[PDB]
Symmetry: D3
């Protein structure tokens, strides 16, 4: 039925977005934690 | 005092990342439950 | 259907606990790892 | 440096347990969820 | 030093591959578990 | 017997997915420990 295959297509999309999401959010954590490491690096040519 | 502040921002970031992936996970789980719960209803209707 | 809804009540309940156990852990490993880095700082402060 | 290596011994040890606790959980939620689906099958078999 | 920034670039790459990895592997789980759901769907126009 | 077999393959898949993300995680953690452990050594050398 177009229906079950409708809902599975919503389900499939719900999961798609949910990886884009979790991948943006993790790409973010790493930027944040990258930034801070790379700053600290600078506070070491200066130690 | 500086080091201690980098490790503040690094703990802020992680927490913020922890808070964020726990939103994504609760939103996909909503969605999927909707679709499930719509299955169940279009089902008493088979 | 009471019974289909009971069960999904169960499915959902597991998923909480499951995801709720997954924070607990994550929080433990960032604690263990927090103290470590934090001791690396003290011992470094006596470089 | 014994002490730097001690600590990393610790860091690594946490990471095991952490990641080792994360399987335990994952295994619990697929168990709970296993039984559920599996009961949905029985109750369906009396459709 | 080119060195610390060397190693961070390895570190950055180690993590990059480690997302490609974990994303292939999950894209796989879903295909596998997609396939099986969509098969079962077919065994229902036939129930 | 069929249903029971789909739920066999579905449990096979998950396990295989569980086994696989636990390789990726142990390989990135190797790598990163190498880089860390190379830091530590190029460090007694500051
Ligand atoms: Zn990306
Ligand atoms: Zn660095
Ligand atoms: Zn620190
Ligand atoms: Zn929540
Ligand atoms: Zn249901
Ligand atoms: Zn918490
Ligand atoms: Zn070390
Ligand atoms: Zn296991
Ligand atoms: Zn992809
Ligand atoms: Zn379907
Ligand atoms: Zn089944
Ligand atoms: Zn392992």
């Amino acid at each position: 039925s177009l229906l079950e295959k409708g809902l599975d297509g919503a389900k499939k999309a719900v999961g798609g977005l949910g990886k884009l999401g979790k991948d943006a959010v993790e790409d973010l954590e790493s930027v944040g934690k990258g930034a801070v490491h790379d700053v600290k690096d600078v506070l070491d040519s200066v130690l």
